[model samples]
Target: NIPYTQLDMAVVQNRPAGSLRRFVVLVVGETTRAANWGLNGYSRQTTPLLAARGDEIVNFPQVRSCGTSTAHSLPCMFSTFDRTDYDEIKAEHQDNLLDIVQRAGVEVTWLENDSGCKGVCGKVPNTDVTSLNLPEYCRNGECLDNILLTKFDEVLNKNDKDAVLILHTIGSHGPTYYERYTEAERKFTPTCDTNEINKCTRATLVNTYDNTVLYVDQFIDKVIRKLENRDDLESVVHYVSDHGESLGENGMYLHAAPYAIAPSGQTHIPMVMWFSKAFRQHGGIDFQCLKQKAAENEYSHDHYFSTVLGLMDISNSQTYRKEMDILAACRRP
Candidate 1:
């Protein structure tokens, strides 16, 4: 029999010894491909807001998603299993990164603006944006990504312990890209306005998609601003897309194609990390070292679990893999 209920992260601990709270907002974007990201050298400059703070942000352009869809990538990302050895059934029964982090005395909250956490937050505290009932943000059970930050202060005040807030955003999910942004955020014009995106011109489809990317850039900028203002807490904002999308690239429209056949647009993702001054000092993370490494290395979802664990100062000798943590090398002893 599989060790379903018996699976436990037995010896978990938050090793950092300090009074300053460590807060991390992990923003998981849906179907936002890297090829269109301005920060990654896309020609359109879709991420101007984030680009403005270029020196402070560590942008990883060569990151690959574990899977080509949310249903596969989301849970796989939170699981300790790497893409090669991933077993869905086994992953479901095992203790995930969130479980280990929460067990180590961190307050973990999942804020959903996307479809769901793909069972990644089954045991953790979570709130759907639609439930907030903010008419300006929600309509017919779907809400804009900004809704995730509406309760930022409330969530932060809920506890004095170190915290990890995961924001699952709708991002650039296609066929409805036109609906993802506000009128003011519709920076790219002549967008594909209907749900049947195939009917629109390829230029218009791309225009609409870029608009959503622009919105995501602004949304992440807002998150950074929120964390920056809270000088009392050491904070960091880490954003990574679950998977990439195909905007009429090689006749593919959206993601979810099998790994073998999926285009680079579906596998290659954008991962951005912004650390606060206090967080760097408190956590002893070397910004210059990480910036250099980010520009040179290729990363994947496999690094996420351990990277977060390392950043939060949470450890479990039994399961934590220091080699897998992207920040392990940059952290000062």
Candidate 2:
């Protein structure tokens, strides 16, 4: 930890505000392969909602994660370090993106459905949404991705302070993909119903995985719809999977393969950004230029820390590295 003083939200508020754009950064668990979305190139419409609103969404087809698993990826992604120079202990001790943003006066809240925030959210407030047990969203032992947003209204209403609500989803966390979504939402046929992944045919495996992505699409659309309906806040949404999954690719079923040996299916993840009109104008985001850059740029989790700072216009040369923000070039001067 640092011997220097910790930050206070009150002090951060005294600093000048950066365009006043609220942000909802969603982190989906175990979502893999950027090509799965129709906007990216997948044949099947796994992301109908995103596809339908294509013009408004920016798709990053080449974003890579620092690690191959949640335990490794989440913390590093949230930290200001790259995988090559990464150290877990150092990450825990160092201030992360959340800390920097909170210190910059942003209302930071992490709503988690996965195991936890991987200690990336220790300095701020967080809710274990899995325990909420809300009706229609949770059944059996698993809570659908849609349920993760059940408390969005409550979270957004916590205060008038410009907020950065992080929705941590249990997205496509597999070994039991069939249980993720309801029977009615299973658009893909002949899903693998059992946990013994290798026992099922490849077709069965792919179908179930694709179905899981469909559920993610629906959940994300719901978040966007809510942001759009709210007139008071100029909101932006950034969804990036913690790490990619390995669904029977090269005999790999689940993730956690050695980094050197991991395949593309286990490394290349889906990253997208949806900015409301208010967010564009208020945040000074050049939407068209951002889209063009999204189509051509290559990035990794290494950039996450500063890119978020860039998004919220919360800049401090000490913590906010302009080179690390992927959309830095597209931002309006």
Candidate 3:
């Protein structure tokens, strides 16, 4: 029995006339850590593209993921449950953010280029990019993050209704970091090209990982640009990693070392947002206030569910907790 099916979202279903159509692009990054992000004071300039748009984007440097692996974090991040109360079996029986949004009469879609949605998109319309078999973006059963962008125009063109498109990206997931990006996106040098990352030097491993992060920066930048060009829609792009990764820190190479003992490198993640001018005015989001709030406080995955609902103006749902929404305090009353 799905408890969320009974949620009341009458306000969303019957929005006031002349209200702008809302469109949100949620980009989920895999195995990308805040410690390695240039926006988070990383030594390397790995996120130059995102950094250049500092004025237009809100970058939350101190955000933590729900878990240390995709199987745990991906589903938990989308659920109303926090990490401490998360159970896979229980989460399976409940409705997630996408499910609730869809029920609110929004056209919700999930485009996956990562391993999978881990059951998060069970009730929503979803497409696995690898299954598309586009020769230019997919190779050897894995497709680039760019593959998700190919369906952007079509997804937006399908309806005039409010929509949320979730793009699950395979970002910085390794020991195959070298394969995550293309030759032109490889800004770092002497990368570790093999799956057996231990065979490579620590410096080389980090270099390879940084290159993947650079590619993710470009991918998010493109998403923001696409949303910006849509004058007919009030759009915003929100991106956060499912979980962080470890590259030879404390002799730990990969993530998922157990919650009790996992390092900060495995929990801390980068979260970013870019809102179009129409979204800022129509949604009543205080851009300057949000920027100050983003820098002054730390956040976690527990805020994801309500914060997304808040952005989409779906506050009437029984499952939506106003206090948990990060934007709640910053909204212009």
Candidate 4:
């Protein structure tokens, strides 16, 4: 029987001693796609950081984002349904995944580089010091990526009960993918400087985007390893974006065109997950099929909310009262 799932389990709850803890940290990247990451087998070495992580990361090469802009996608991912097929949920509902977690007794905090989840984090404690469009390491760049790292270790070192930290990256978000990546990240030759992406001569822009993805790989590797030994924690990282971005593929720059207009570049996104082996065993998940389905491209952001409920070991293990549970669907019938 197909049953609808709910996301009311992420609430911070008190646990008995020896209980495995659960943490969900989502690093949101802008305008990234599966075709550019080394994990997805891009010609260049984009995801080398994740590739070297010894099977600790699961790369879902065929994942698709639910929307094309921050305005719609972020809320969709955090609210309820996460793929293009799901209806948009209202912020007023506040009863989505974060709310469910709050009710479940799990501590929820959002650290963002974008506008803070379209006000989704308004009710939750959050910090949005900047937007993803900012570039880092530019001697005098207008947008700065290091701000999140500035004075931010306090949060990382804080002794919170249970935690969720999100990082918003202004990745390959371009006509300016060239600007996002440094000269050193260029594994592709003759990088494209023109804004026209579909010109065939412009594929170099993709190369730059891939390079930025490589940077993201380094960021995740550091964050995960630092928190791995926390005796007071159970943690994992899962990610999907609000929407995908398009280069010059269809004469587009910043996305938002209808499906009929912009198809390939706007929907496909790279999805990844990492769990402390300890957390997986504690939650009774073998991590077998989930990893396999990811490799097979059978997953989407649709499972974003449901899967977290399962991870946090939240009760009701389903989307907020739907038959479509990620835990059940990802399993072999």
Candidate 4 deviant stretches above 4 angstroms: 1-17, 82-94, 131-147, 150-152, 192-201, 316-333
RMSD of each: 1.5, 2.6, 1.8, 5.2
TM-score: which is higher, 1 or 4? 1
lDDT of 4 by residue, 1-333 (tens): 333444445444444466855566777777777666678777777777778885788777887666777766777776675454555533344356676765676667777664346756765678766633344544223233445565346666565556566677666566655655555556666666655555545456655566667656666676677667765666787655556766556556557767555566677777777877566555544467767766764655566776665555566434543333455544332
Alpha-carbon lDDT of model 1 = 0.87
User: For each candidate, what is the lDDT?
Assistant: 0.87, 0.77, 0.86, 0.63
Of candidate 2, the 10-residue stretch with the lowest lDDT total is 7-16
Superposed Cα deviation of residue 243, candidate 4 (Å): 2.5
Tell me the number of clashing residue pairs for each predicted model: 0, 0, 0, 26
Residue by residue across 2-56, what tens digits does model 2's lDDT show?
4433332332432234544465555555555665655678899888998899678
Model 3 local distance difference test score? 0.86
Q: Candidate 3 on 1-333: residue-level lDDT in tens? A: 445333444536544469889888999999999999999899998898999987787999899989999999988988878888998877777778788889888899999888788988868889887788788877778888898888988888888988999999998888788878998778888988989998999999999999999999999999988878767779989999988888898799789878778899999999998998788767787778899999999999999999988877774688888888999989777
Quote each prediction's TM-score.
0.96, 0.92, 0.95, 0.80
Off by over 4 Å in 3: 1-11, 14-16
lDDT of 3 at 266: 91
The TM-score-based order of candidates, best leading, equals 1, 3, 2, 4
The window of 10 residues in a row where model 3 has the poorest summed lDDT is: 2-11
Better of 1 and 4 by lDDT: 1
Q: After superposition, how far is residue 210 of candidate 4 from its true place, in Å?
A: 2.3
